[PDB]
Amino acid sequence: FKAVADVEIDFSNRAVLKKYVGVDHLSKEQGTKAKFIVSLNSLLEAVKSVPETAEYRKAIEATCQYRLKVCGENNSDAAIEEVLDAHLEELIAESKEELRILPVLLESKPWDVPADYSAPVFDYVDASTILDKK
Amino acid sequence: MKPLTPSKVSNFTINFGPQHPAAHGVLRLVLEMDGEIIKRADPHIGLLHRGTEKLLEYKTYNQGIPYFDRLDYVSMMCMEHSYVLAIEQLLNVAVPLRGQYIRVLFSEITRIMNHILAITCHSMDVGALTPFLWAFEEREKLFEFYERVSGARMHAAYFRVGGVAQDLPIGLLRDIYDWSRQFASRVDEMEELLTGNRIWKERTIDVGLVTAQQAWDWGCSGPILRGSGIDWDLRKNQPYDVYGRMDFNVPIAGHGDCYDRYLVRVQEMRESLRIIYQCLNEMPDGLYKTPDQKVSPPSRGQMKQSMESLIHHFKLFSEGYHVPAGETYRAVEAPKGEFGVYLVSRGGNRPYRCKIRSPGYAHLQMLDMVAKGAMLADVVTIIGTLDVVFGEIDR
Amino acid sequence: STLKPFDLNANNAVRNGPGGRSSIGGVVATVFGANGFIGSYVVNEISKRGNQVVCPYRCNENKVQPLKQMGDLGQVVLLPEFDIHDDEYIRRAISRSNVVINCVGIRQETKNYSYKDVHVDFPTRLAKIVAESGKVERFIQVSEMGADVSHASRRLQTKAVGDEAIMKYIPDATIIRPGNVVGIEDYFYNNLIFQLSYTIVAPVINNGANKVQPTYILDVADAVVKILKDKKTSGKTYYLGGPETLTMRQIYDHLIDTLRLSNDDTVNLRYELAKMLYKPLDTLRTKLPEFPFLGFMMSSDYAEEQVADSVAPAGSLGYKDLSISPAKVTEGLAIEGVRFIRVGGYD
Amino acid sequence: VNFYDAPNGPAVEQVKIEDEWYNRQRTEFNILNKQPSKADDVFIAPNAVVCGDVDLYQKVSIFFGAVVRGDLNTIRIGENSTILDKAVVHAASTSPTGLNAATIIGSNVTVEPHAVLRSCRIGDNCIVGARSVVCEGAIMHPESVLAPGSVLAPGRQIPSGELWAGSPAKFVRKLTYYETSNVIRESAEHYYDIATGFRNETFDHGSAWRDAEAYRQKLVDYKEYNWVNYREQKYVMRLQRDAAELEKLL
Amino acid sequence: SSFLPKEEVESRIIAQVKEQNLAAGIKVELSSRFDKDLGLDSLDKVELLISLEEDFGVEVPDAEIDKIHTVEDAVNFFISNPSS
Amino acid sequence: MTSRFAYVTCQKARNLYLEACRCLPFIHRLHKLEEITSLKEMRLIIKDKFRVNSPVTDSRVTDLLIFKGREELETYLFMYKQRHHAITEYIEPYQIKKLLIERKSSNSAFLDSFYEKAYPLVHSKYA
Amino acid sequence: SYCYARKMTDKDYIAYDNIKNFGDNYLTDYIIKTVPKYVTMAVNGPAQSSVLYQEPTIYTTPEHIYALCAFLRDHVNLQYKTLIDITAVDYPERSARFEVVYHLLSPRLNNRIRIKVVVDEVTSVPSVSRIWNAANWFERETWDMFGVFFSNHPDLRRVLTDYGFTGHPLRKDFPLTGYTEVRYDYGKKRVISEPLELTQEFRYFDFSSPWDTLSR
């Protein structure tokens, strides 16, 4: 991107960048790696309420495990940002946003479906695929 | 046994009527104000609701293109572009490269005039009238390009399904290139009068503050997103034409105030100039409309020499093409934000449902949150940054 | 309610549509005096129902601007140069017309035109021109209630003589004789208000004894329509008085009340004094152009017509024969216009 | 747990009872928006507990172990009225009768040890005996005496000048003129003299704070003592709570 | 509890009851149910109560409107109420 | 705290009509309609507006109709609509009906419509 | 989540490979498996984002719309932080005439999703304004044009149509020209509404061919 400010600032400082783009609005906290680890572990604790054989709980477990791994090999907090395509602050806000909808999911219990549940899926086949070759 | 504390009451339910130094169109605004400070803003719309969406249902697809030009009178090309893209997606029609280049070029041109009008009319609303008149001469130079390609300065109806209506007239590329050679200097002249001016700074700084979360929540797009720190552009994130080839950088600011969005719009004009130069240099040669004559009209000599071409001409100018049953939503980066058309086809020659997604509708919805705690004078500036067009808001 | 036809010959063929602006009514009308207060509403009533109205007017584009909106495309025809002394223009105006309405009248004399010209010569000449044609089926003339041959005022006497001439040439003409007409553009309440507010003293002839029967403009306009929708009305004079008979003192008092004037500004300028103050000023009027400063009120004719009772004769045709209930002019919508000025909660 | 709309603000630091190493009970303390009021000459024993909307008039004596809880509704104790040892005065939220549920005690009223009063009207110059229970809505009219070990059932009345006894309290005898005039007032005056004595040998800040100050000074010397701006922290906690309450979806 | 004379308030209420199209003819007195004797509709009953609102300068509760049923009941309600 | 002595919408439209009647004076003052019309006179029109929708019996359709009628009231109450709107749509037709004098037609309903127009279903203007 | 600007240079990529794959081909299956009760059927078709890709369409019932929207916004993998628009389509041939359409954006996934709730004239759709503040005006417009009631809406009012308009114009049974017309009267100095009359009627030209096959 291009800064629209005539003033000259250094965007490799990795803090002047965050101040310029307004990440501080998202969270006033610094957003270090340990905070991300704590947030992921708190999400893992929270999803315990969801039944063990629930696809949603398995999904959250898999995502949290993937992100805890990405924290594992990468000792640099910026490296985690590059791998996850996000600022550490918004990665931390992500788990809280996930926490917000757990009550709404525990009220309706979407995972309860009969053992004959079937969702019909219709898929589109493009003519370019067939016409050019088979 | 601890005393309770009472509060104060707000009155002054003003009615702010159609008012000339504001975003163009008719705005009826009901404002509840505690003293000189606003507590609620309720925009009253429907004053330019012409029933466009229902009228589209009674017209053929090619007959409904001029509706999109008149939805937004500032940016016509971008508005008709989404409609033609949606019809092309449903029809599975491939646009030739020269027509794709012509569409991108004229889209950038209309983007530039939109930004010129927005900035200079906003300055006029503040009370500075010199940038405004300094800008009309540039806007005339660009209207002259439109009248050259289409014969209409405003409602060209130049973009068509599968390409463009006619080819670029000889000598146009040179003239556009000259306007481009001088455009940057003209923009710098305008920028000095606005930027750095203490009264302009005081009027615009820290007014209309928006945060990224608020923008996504309210569905805002374009300059509002980019003035708050969001690196999101449809031309880059979701390319729709030869925009992917084009090399340009997103302008980003972080504060979200009125000034940041003004700076973003100026830089957007500069980026559009860069895209135009690339379009001019890389303009290909060949067909400007799709070779298929079951979706595009035949050429006049061809209709006058061939039976199949006369048949195709007759059936395309009487019945029109039949669009296969399906639904699609195609969005384009309009100068005011994201403009999209949700087209539902049942297999006939007329659209069954054509929903128009207004970029300015959500901004006018955001007006109340933004204009809380402000003053009667700040409303004009806040409306200016939203840059709302009420024919565009009221379809 | 069932729409009643305009009782004109061969209307059944030409008429078509619901009766609105875009419908076809088989009435082509030449309304003389269209730009006037009475004429404009008659034009509105006729043109509203899809009919075509020819409006001869003395050159004045701004005065005839409201008539342009009255009808759909090609329905309101405005003829630019109207002269009461020009026969050929009158023949051209009524060429296609099957009904002719005459609302041309002058409240005061000038140097160019006197009462005898406008109120006598024009009706007779127009009557002959209409009679020779034969296509014109209905003729309506608008006159005052107090018009009589044995009247002191020259205006009300000349009007009656012209009406008799019209009756002689066209026996089937209908003479509409409304009272003082109340409206937004009327010359009754508006002149009374201007007298009460922007005049040093409000002179009242005698003590306001004279009785009047004011009527609302919409009632007279509807009465014209009811005249045209019945052929049995032809050859008859209708005294379209208002629902209530009021003395002039009551109307002045009630205007003072509605406007919430501080007190009564009216004075007693009894008769036999106005007959000496205004008598030279009439000779002044007949030798000078139209002047806004003095007019209508400041004439001996007005004093003479304000010393008599302008009320409907007992045995007479009126609104009841036309099945119209006149609206009261001292209450309701009729009085809103004076009400907007001041009601004591206002300013 | 934490009341965020409390009049003085939320609690920045809350300590568990297990972590307490000394007794911190306060003889007068505030329960949220309800504040006890006392006169200058009102004696509250160190053991005694007075909380809530309790109004103590002049010469009121609260002796050792007495609990006057004004949490549900208002308690008023009249002039020269003594609450003796281990006697509980409490107020109900509502009364069964439908009248006001405040516990109003008149002047020169002696509540003998271990007597429980809840949402009752006690008239002037009355004696409630030891282990006497006066239930909600029961009204004792002035110059009446309830004998020890007696219960006044809810919504019941003891007339003036009468001595009542029994678990279903019943009339026993009419109190004599000398009794009502002198002795009932004299008992309250005697207990006022005893409480005046106890007040006279009480120091304003008795030397029990020194022991806690020694621990605080040790923490200061070893550099574990932390200076906390409780005012700012309360403000920040309330701000965070409001932001979270706005964010929540359900 | 009658703040003002029973005869006066009754005459006034029956005067307003007469104003309604029906509720007249042979029986316009007390002991007449609005909907079962007088042919009144529920909306007409509510409007009649509002007209009594204008006559006696005092409001009627909506739950009381659910409770009111007769000409006796309305006059009883208006006599009972001190503002009257 | 206990003694044995201690403890011892079919008409939604009616509520909406009550709301309209109670809000009538406010719209009279807001729309400057005191002199033109009386409160009772408007209260009469509102009933006819309610009576047009009598045939419906479904609860859900009733809910929608009530919501729409509340919207109609709110337009006048919040000054969305103007004084001339109130004159044109309520007060003027009601006053016109009172001022109307008509001859009791001896011809039946069929004869009158037959004389009037070929297609009775088409409306007539300015009758 | 929120596409806050992070990379200063070389952000030429449209998105990462894994993020594209998870949303190119697993998105509908992931939704169905994760929240099965909400989904009734799913359609993969031509993409809203682009011509080349494929974007999901999910059909759900009115009762589950609020929970499905809440799941879509805040699920870590699926973050549809934006409501592009809300729309209804009238199908008079169907018993359940109206199809309420929701269009969403995930900036993180760079994907578009379409959610459909099929209702009739009497049934109501719960408002999703608490999930997305932009919904308020969109649901007000849907109520105005089509007559679909939205439950628990803060203030459901008409937006586009004239004051006093009772009909819903975008219903297929509503005349193109409407029922009334507006004119100024000289007699009554007011602008008034009258029944419709057309000087020239709208000419419907029937261009359909017997031999056409695309018509469904």
Ligand SMILES: NC(=O)C1=CN([C@@H]2O[C@H](COP(=O)(O)OP(=O)(O)OC[C@H]3O[C@@H](n4cnc5c(N)ncnc54)[C@H](OP(=O)(O)O)[C@@H]3O)[C@@H](O)[C@H]2O)C=CC1
């Ligand atoms: N109070 C009332 O309004 C009443 C009126 N009437 C009668 O109805 C008639 C008109 O009423 P009103 O409309 O109020 O009077 P107006 O003067 O308002 O209308 C007069 C019309 O006649 C035209 N006119 C006057 N003199 C001449 C002329 N010499 N040559 C050509 N055109 C001329 C005027 O045109 P220009 O404007 O160019 O003069 C105007 O259009 C009068 O005769 C009046 O007596 C009946 C009852 C009461």
Ligand SMILES: CCCCCCCCCCCC(=O)SCCNC(=O)CCNC(=O)[C@H](O)C(C)(C)COP(=O)(O)O
């Ligand atoms: C100037 C401002 C004027 C405002 C005008 C407002 C006009 C609103 C018009 C809306 C009309 C409706 O709501 S119609 C409400 C729905 N219609 C129904 O019929 C449901 C049940 N109906 C009945 O019971 C009877 O018909 C009934 C006669 C109603 C007896 O009312 P009650 O149920 O009590 O007994």
